[PDB]
Design a protein around this ligand. Structure first.
Ligand SMILES: O=C(C[C@@H](Cc1ccc2ccccc2c1)n1nncc1CNC(=O)c1ccc(F)cc1)NO
Ligand SMILES: [Zn+2]
Length: 956
């Protein structure tokens, strides 16, 4: 009966396993809405997607849409306090973010379920009368600048913008979307433009209700959620804006048959093949692009990748359709290159067209389409329950593209096989439509062009007629076959009954010298899935840099070897992860439980009986070398976190130590290493999901039996199972470690205040203190002082120890950042002494909500248990215990904690600082306190030698 509602879709197609309730509707002002009712959710959430993006930026103000997106957070007419939005979310267990693409601006938040209306109301205001405060504008432009600078020396962004720069300049596709101080402040000042008017002009003109989709999720009924949404959003004005479309492709004839040679920052070797194609979005019911991408990107036997990998030319391949905008898209084939591959780009591409030609010969395969359909069907039926925040943002995005009743299924289900469209798309993948780009350091000094925004060094050539002609005449290579029927498709979806002796938390159901087995039968989610987690402990995994390298290469080679076999299983919703740790090996198998034992057995056998291919060994090692080198190109704030991890751990091998020892890794030494590594192990496992206790025991026994039979594995001694300790810093100590980032012209800094061994009391002092300072830290260090885009504060936990950490990436020198953080702490000391008891309890409640938030999917709950197990703390009921203690803390308790552990003149202050200087830097408002002379760390080894080591935390 409501006049504010144009239409109400009551049957929203969902999965039969989804317990959440849905109602879609279209408001009178044209807003498409989806309501999600979940009476169990601990956090509520909303999201709004505007169908305008950076592609609609004014030509004279690059990055206006992105900039506008930052500004909406900084105040509205109804809520004028600059950080009201962020502070409210913080005080109620919430959080918020947004992003800008070429065609979308997407805003989202979550919050304690009891405060949805308050959050949603403050949120709705973003879209009616934001302030765009001139003072805030002048500040937040710096955050955007900082965000861009961060991307300037990043190879992904450089190539991203380079593609745009090599097509039609007249086309909106060529726009620089991020923006920076120049395009947002500096140039607009030369040209006398009022940026604040431009923000208001843009907001008013494009942020129309007809271009908006909204998704809200809470405990409230569908009826109540309707009243709430309608009340707040029907007030949004409808300017009846036409939806932008871009019918003309950014790549015209002059832009085809072109080759680009590009110099990267990292030492990487990549080949990009790109085919311009028509917008395939309408064909979404058949999805011709996904069909073709499925085949061209296949990694099993007979595939394009298989042959290229055997030729020793590539290691990995990506293929398929790539989004552009409304009216144009891309089909791409990207491979990485071996040293050999780099000298065979022409032959590689020939092989690409040979495979495409195979597809034309056989023509569309309906069983293939039918297979994809049925997998997606099963995928959708047994879909994991999503986290609200991401779910609402995802859906608010696609409401623009599908009927209300179809949004949930739209991105999952294939409906009708259309070979006519497949052939049509396949017809665009020809040499006369190709663009080729090669990324390699080998082009250094040989380029004649510069992209103006990032400065990328490149050369452009026309592909020779001879070569194009050669590609057009591609004969059928007998090495290329269509994929076989997927043998890993699951068939047994039976949910095993809950055993009588079943337990709420994992139970230790096996405890021998060989292995410690933790088991839980799923009692929450009831999907036909299981998680199998294994830690293999061995001293020889991390005993020195050389052996660390070999543990890595061992597992990489093993994965490279299994890829063809396991790729199918991956498509059938059964994946595995295998990586080396500082304690040995980690192996996880996740997915549909039906065929898990088959893949698991295959992996353990491959481990125990592995025969290294020498050609594969040389290639992977070479890549691993560059991998170590390329760390030089990581962000400063990452270098900072890295160096700190090195400093504070008992044992740690640096990139340089590893890279030197790499040269000494020969095939013989690796072949010797593996049987040595496997000879003595301890296995600690978590088996959690749709399995019974006997099944679990059976799985564990196979793993042991396989290792014993093929590798002659024997148990470790209990005395060999020592975990590493954390360096115990002296009272009132302050150490500083300094490094330079050779790639980036930003500086980084991490500050670590080491409190003490983890324990219920110490844990909750830190966590509560961190909760209280969280929002203020962001608002002060970034929003007010604008030190940088990346500003972070929070707990740090390692080796059973913990402390408070600040992480900042800035253009200012680290020694400056030091004072500002220190200045801030004093600000917080006074702020807390002032805050009301009611405000203090608010934070306690917020922290509690965050800690008690239930896991929504099996993998989240398993990760939670697994954390307790590898940490050797085994505190599975931790949350109830720790939250309960939390509620008994007082303001006076936290003040004592601060005055004793954290304050500048605290008796037990334990501070270490890592400073990463920018590329060009030199060696070195509220009032900042005076700081003591810091002990400059000259040498990590010398540093650790002079300090004691903490104990290890005792198990529960
Ligand atoms: O920049 C953006 C979105 C992010 C930028 C952003 C947000 C969070 C980050 C956390 C760690 C490191 C960098 C980060 C960068 N952004 N843009 N405008 C506001 C925000 C963050 N919004 C918040 O409400 C917030 C965030 C953190 C907090 F503690 C309290 C409130 N889109 O382009
Ligand atoms: Zn941003």
């Amino acid at each position: 009966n409501n006049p504010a509602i144009k239409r109400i879709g009551n049957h929203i197609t969902k999965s039969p396993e989804d317990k959440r309730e849905y109602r879609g509707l279209e408001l009178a002002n044209g807003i498409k809405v989806l309501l999600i009712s979940d009476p169990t959710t601990d956090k509520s959430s909303a999201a709004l997607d505007v169908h305008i993006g950076s592609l609609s930026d004014p030509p004279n103000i690059a990055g206006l849409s992105h900039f506008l997106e930052h500004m909406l957070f900084l105040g509205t007419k109804k809520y004028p306090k600059e950080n009201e939005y962020s502070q409210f979310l913080s005080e109620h267990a919430g959080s918020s973010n947004a992003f800008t693409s070429g065609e979308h601006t997407n805003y989202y938040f979550d919050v304690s379920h009891e405060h949805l209306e308050g959050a949603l109301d403050r949120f709705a205001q973003f879209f009616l009368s934001p302030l765009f405060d001139e003072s805030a504008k002048d500040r937040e432009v710096n955050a955007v600048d900082s965000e861009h600078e961060k991307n300037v020396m990043n190879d992904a962004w450089r190539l991203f913008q380079l593609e745009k720069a090599t097509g039609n300049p007249k086309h909106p596709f060529s726009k620089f979307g991020t923006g920076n101080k120049y395009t947002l402040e500096t140039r607009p000042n030369q040209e006398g433009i009022d940026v604040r008017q431009e923000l208001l002009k843009f907001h008013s003109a494009y942020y129309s209700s007809n271009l908006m989709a909204v998704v809200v999720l809470g405990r409230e009924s569908l009826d109540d959620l309707t009243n709430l949404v309608v009340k707040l959003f029907s007030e949004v004005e409808n300017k009846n804006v036409p939806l932008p479309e871009f019918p003309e492709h950014p790549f015209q004839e002059e832009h085809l048959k072109q080759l680009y040679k590009i110099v990267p920052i990292k030492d990487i070797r990549n080949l990009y093949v790109t085919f311009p194609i028509p917008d395939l979005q309408k064909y979404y019911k058949s999805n011709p692009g996904h069909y073709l991408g499925h085949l061209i990107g296949h990694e099993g036997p007979g595939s394009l990748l298989s042959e290229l990998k055997s030729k020793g030319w590539v290691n990995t391949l990506v293929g398929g359709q790539k989004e552009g905008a409304r009216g144009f898209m891309f089909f791409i084939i990207n491979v990485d290159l071996t040293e050999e591959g780099l000298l065979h780009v022409e032959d590689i591409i020939l092989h690409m067209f040979q495979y495409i030609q195979k597809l034309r010969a056989e023509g569309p395969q309906e069983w293939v389409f039918q297979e994809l359909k049925d997998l997606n069907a099963v995928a959708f039926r047994f879909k994991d329950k999503e986290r609200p925040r991401g779910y609402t943002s995802k859906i608010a995005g696609i409401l623009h593209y599908y009927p209300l009743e179809e949004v949930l299924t739209a991105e999952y289900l294939l409906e009708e096989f259309r070979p006519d469209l497949i052939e049509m798309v396949l017809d665009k993948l020809r040499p006369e439509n190709v663009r080729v780009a090669i990324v390699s350091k080998s082009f250094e000094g040989k380029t004649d062009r510069t992209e103006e925004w990032y400065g990328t060094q490149y050369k452009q050539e026309a592909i020779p007629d001879e070569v194009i002609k050669k590609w057009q005449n591609a004969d059928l290579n007998g090495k290329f076959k269509l994929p076989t029927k997927n043998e890993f498709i699951p068939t047994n979806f039976e949910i095993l009954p809950l055993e009588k002796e079943a337990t709420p938390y994992p139970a230790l159901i096996k405890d021998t010298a060989m292995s410690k087995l933790w088991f839980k039968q799923d009692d929450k989610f009831f999907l036909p899935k299981a998680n199998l987690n294994f830690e293999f402990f061995s001293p020889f995994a991390y005993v020195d840099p050389l052996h660390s390298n070999m543990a890595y290469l061992y597992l990489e080679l093993l994965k490279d070897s299994l890829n063809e076999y396991a790729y199918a299983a991956e498509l059938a919703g059964l994946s595995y992860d295998l990586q080396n740790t500082i304690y040995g090996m980690y192996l996880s198998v996740k997915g549909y439980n039906d065929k898990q034992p088959i893949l698991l057995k295959k992996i353990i056998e491959k481990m125990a009986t592995f025969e290294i291919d020498e050609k594969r060994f040389e290639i992977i090692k070479e890549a691993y070398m560059r991998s170590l080198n390329n760390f030089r190109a990581e962000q400063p704030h990452q270098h900072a976190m890295y160096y700190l991890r090195l400093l504070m751990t008992e044992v740690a091998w640096t990139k340089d130590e590893l890279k030197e020892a790499l040269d000494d890794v020969t095939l013989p030494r690796l072949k010797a290493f593996i049987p040595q590594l496997l000879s003595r192990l301890h296995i600690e496992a978590l088996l959690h999901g749709n399995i019974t206790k006997q099944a679990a025991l059976g799985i564990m026994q196979m793993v042991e039996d396989t290792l014993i039979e093929h590798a002659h594995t024997k148990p470790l001694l209990p005395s060999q199972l020592v975990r590493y300790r954390e360096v115990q810093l002296p009272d009132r100590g302050w150490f500083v470690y300094q490094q330079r980032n050779e790639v980036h012209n930003n500086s980084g800094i991490e500050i670590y205040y080491q409190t003490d061994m983890q324990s219920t009391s110490e844990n909750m002092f830190l966590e509560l203190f961190a909760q209280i300072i969280s929002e203020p830290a962001f608002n002060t260090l970034r929003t007010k002082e604008q030190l940088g885009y990346i500003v972070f504060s929070g707990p740090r936990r390692a080796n059973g120890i913990q402390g408070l950490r600040f992480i900042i990436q800035s253009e200012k020198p680290p020694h400056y950042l030091e004072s500002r953080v220190e200045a801030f702490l004093i600000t917080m000391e006074k702020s807390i002494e002032d805050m009301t008891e009611e405000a203090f309890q608010k934070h306690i409640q917020a922290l509690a909500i965050r800690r008690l938030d239930k896991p929504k999917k099996l993998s989240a709950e398993s990760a939670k248990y697994w954390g307790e197990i590898i940490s050797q703390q085994y505190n599975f009921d931790r949350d109830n215990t720790e939250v309960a203690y939390l509620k008994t803390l007082t303001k006076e308790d936290i003040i004592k904690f601060y005055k004793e552990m954290l304050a500048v003149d605290a008796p037990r202050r334990h501070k270490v600082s890592v400073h990463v200087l920018a590329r060009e830097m030199d060696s070195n408002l509220s009032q900042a306190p005076a700081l003591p002379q810091p002990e400059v760390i000259q040498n990590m080894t010398e540093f650790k030698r002079g300090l004691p080591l903490f104990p290890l935390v005792k198990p529960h």
